Design a protein around this ligand. Structure first.
Ligand SMILES: [Cl-]
Ligand SMILES: [Cl-]
Ligand SMILES: [Cl-]
Ligand SMILES: [Cl-]
Ligand SMILES: [Cl-]
Ligand SMILES: [Cl-]
Lengths: 245, 245, 245, 245, 245, 245
């Protein structure tokens, strides 16, 4: 009855499976998850260059989603790459996983801490905090200092480091909740929540619920003004498939 | 399966019915709405004095909700009176209708406008914008210059004035969506949305979906630090019933 | 000639005496202090639940003050509970002790540090900083990690911990002054000021001087718009005594 | 018993008399006002160039005040020129009239409007709002479009224009109080307050009360860190008299 | 001696010529301008979708520039698309035209106004203001309500509308300068400046001077942390050419 | 062909030589540097008192510069004393060294750290950050805890301490660049940049390039409104020479 396109903006099939599984586990009855990734792009997103590439992959999948008539979309990278570009292109609502996780966090705690991957992604998270208006609600940001794909490498090392940093954060930061700063951490939310007895929030699941909520409310992206469909233009080269509408 | 206590912070039975009906119309299967109001308080909330009284009524109902074992609560006045006090007292999550409406608005538009009741409530809305961090996302705030209860007076006058102000806002403000600034406007959201072809958002329905989403995510108010249960204290007089736990 | 109602928002007679004594010690000639507390409420204020209860007690006393024809009021809890609600109800000006202490601090130092009671009250102080617009002027906030009433328990332990934290703050924070974050610390201001040779500010005394200043200036709360007397409404139950005017 | 040096930063004897009279009218018993102006400077302050000159004149008088052993100082130009430089040099507290008027305004209204002289002084007022942290509390700023000295020219034209702009502001701005943006408007505060039935605030009188309050509280400028006495240095030329201490 | 790659992020050869000419007219002796545009993309940039496409075109040209050993780059669209992604990829500095125009504006005026193309680009300009930290320095933003390419259509209509809006802005906004909000307006800066006798700033020329200044200062993009070269990754499909280094 | 007056706001001939040499080393062909200092003032600037004195010395030299017909001016103290007053008085543009260094820093790094002289100057730097809008772009501020003139004392001690603090900053702060917080550090920029392999920015050289850029762009200070020439006034005493125009 409700179809939600969950877009992994990176090309890693491994991470697409982690993300898709987290999406399906919290999905309401009647919700179908379509877990996808771009055909062309970058295997993981860890910086501004990666984000700009991922944004175009997101747009490719948004187009696919829209021609399939999906009810909504999630952007399952913590940089929310191409969020506003996607909202212009899409009919249904588009929710980012950083956006969704941060929003939820303000509903269950006064302040939250972020636990992310590499140090260079911290500035990306900071920018989103300021953009979404949640900077005052974030007590601290931490990186585990391992690449994104370390979460899929089978060792459990990155998972253990997330745990240790969550404990440290709750002891030191003066925050009441954790926001996980990576789509690949989606699996850890429920276990850390039960273990640490505080909300540990995965944006993937959170974004699924937001799309479902918006659909049930009969609310979709405003096509009045800023997020109107793109002006009709001739797109050249590899971009020509992006807006057939 | 899921029980959500929807608290009208004012004592108006009329408004409690409007609010309860809006809550039930968007509720997911298996969700039961418990539409309540305080036994003692003010018939409508239009200023700081009214809010302080309403906050204590909210707390009385939160206590009732918690002893009944409800899954979550909504505070159905646009001042979100007693929100943080309620989160301390409650086990399940507590969502305000201004909070919920504003959050949803940022998901479907770049900026929104608020349409509220009396001029003196504008400063209350402004304070919430700054508190929740959405000030940059709000293009403008407008009052229809009629008391809250005018919405229940049967004339359709307040309803018509909301409509006219929504049209005016969308023409002038540079915003893509409307946030309704009163629990009693809940009925108008879906009709104005279809009529004006932009999201017109009722916080009551929005807050119901947030409680449902949080419950499905296994997330509840953090009891670590700021929103921990109140320190155990002897409450005197009319307050002695508030915290039997 | 000038009568100032100093309202301890908690029910502790012990703290009411500390507060009343601090108020009388700095009062100008011709100023009479009326040190009061609510008949029903909470013995100490340490969180959002406590604040919401205290706000209604403040309002009960504001009503008493106004029917007695007092010239002004102070709210002698560092959360300034019910400040705006009180200004609506009162004719004379109403000054909070956090408000007053923070205002004074910006007049004698570039930045100040706050020394308060429990960790969970820090977020309350932070919110007031942002509301009053003094966030940039506050270098740091510290808690002594003892309940409010520890200040009245006779051991001198809380008093010693305030001293130690003040010294630490002045060494580490890059601030030129201390704001005491509790009505019960009122006694310590003058001694710590002389001892540490920097302004250590008690909001109780500071608020008394503000009421006196405003009265001498012929300035009272604006009854135009936001802080106008509450809309005339029927108050039910235990609230019915709040607005007989 | 208490001696307060009220410094008109401009060289106009006419304005010094207006300022001195406003200071004496609200002064507490036992307070002596010393109304002064620099020996060298500018006849009125209307821009950044004027302010920089006025700041040095303020410092010359601060030195005189300090060698006379005054209890405190006011800077009676609405640009508060040389405020922090003065606090370094002075032992007693130094209060600006913009600072004092704005502080008082937040105690009696949610938001205020400013009515000042020339358009080019608006940016000066805006900068002070941001510096003191009151930007959110200021609804609007207006200029009467007449030079500062028009207030002393005997025609009553500038006085009438202040009145008309105050009425306009209260009708249009959504504010509950007026801050007068010129030392020469000091005379109008009490009459406009009675006439318009809202607080109309003169910073001159307000600053006098702040100095009196701080003195009664045993609080003076912090000499720890930022506002410590200037580093001992050889001052050349016309500056050599500024710091004989 | 100094080679500066000026990148038109849109595919319009017409606009590339306007941009290249504006760049060459202010270039210092010894500076060579390389005016380029992407091989694949969108003919004009008017919204978020357009920006995301343009960012990847910018990156394609950055790569070309870097393999040619250019000294620096400018991004000649007023959305500064792909600015941070480009700084990661490039060795020499990368300056956006909105960034450069806004920076210059704060050096010659207290506040500026923006005159841009379509209403839907205003929110893009607003976001950049907040990101670069210039929001307080911008008095107002205006659109001429014509598409970007109207500037190249030969009628002089868009040019006349820019002029009229500049005059209107200087009369109404309380600003001392204009920032042109489109690369295609580059031609108008010098003529409007002479005609209106205020700074009217073209970001294209401004960005050229910044690259020249940074090169002469021996300053280039920091490769420490946030703007380090992208992590070495396998790029698939049409993206595989982006990072051969 | 281009004449730039570089004003050392302090009276130290030693520092004037350091500043003049740094200015000449990056100057474009055809640019003549006029390195000057006031005839009367303070030997070094380390606090608010010093700044107010230095501002008037700056104005004295601005007048000299303008009667000589210079193309622009730099204010070579890191407090940018008298910047706006100077822009009013001058015809050519006036650039501060803090202003210029901070502006450049945002072009080559996401965030920067400041390394300055005495602890009491940190608050001055903080105020400029907020004024120029760069507060979010500054990761941290550090003082070497030595007076300004220690840089000219020949021991190399202050120089070594700058180096050590730069290394520490880059390890700890999460910043990609250093802004030198003193005119006397100008010499160190190029050596530390090469040594630490990140941009280490001297505002003196940076400000020279900005004046050159603005002149080449045909842009000068706006004489419309806020930065118009001062209102024609009779200046008395030692100030009478400041505005003969
Ligand atoms: Cl991610
Ligand atoms: Cl409501
Ligand atoms: Cl308290
Ligand atoms: Cl004035
Ligand atoms: Cl453009
Ligand atoms: Cl310096």
């Amino acid at each position: 009855s409700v179809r939600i396109q969950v877009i992994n903006p990176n090309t890693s099939l491994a991470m697409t499976e982690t993300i898709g599984a987290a999406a399906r586990a919290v999905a309401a009855p009647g919700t179908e998850i379509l877990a996808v990734c771009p055909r062309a792009g970058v295997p993981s997103i860890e910086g501004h260059f990666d984000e700009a590439i991922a944004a175009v992959g997101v747009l490719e999948q948004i187009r696919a989603g829209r021609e399939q008539g999906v009810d909504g979309h999630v952007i399952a990278c913590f940089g929310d790459p191409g969020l506003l570009a996607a909202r212009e292109l899409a009919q249904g609502p588009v929710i980012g996983i950083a956006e969704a996780a941060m929003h939820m966090a303000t509903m269950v705690a006064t302040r939250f801490s972020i636990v992310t991957t590499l140090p260079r992604t911290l500035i990306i998270a900071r920018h989103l905090l300021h953009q979404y208006g949640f900077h005052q609600h974030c007590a601290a940001l931490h990186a585990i200092d391992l690449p994104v794909l370390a979460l899929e490498d089978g060792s459990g090392l990155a998972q253990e480091k997330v745990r240790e940093r969550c404990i440290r954060a709750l002891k030191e930061d003066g925050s009441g909740a954790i926001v996980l700063g990576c789509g690949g951490m989606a699996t850890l939310a429920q276990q850390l929540t039960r273990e640490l007895r505080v909300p540990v929030i995965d944006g993937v699941s959170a974004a699924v619920k937001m799309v479902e909520s918006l659909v049930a409310l009969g609310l979709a992206t405003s096509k009045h003004g800023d997020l109107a469909f793109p002006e009709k233009k001739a797109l050249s080269g590899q971009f020509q498939s992006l807006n057939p509408f």
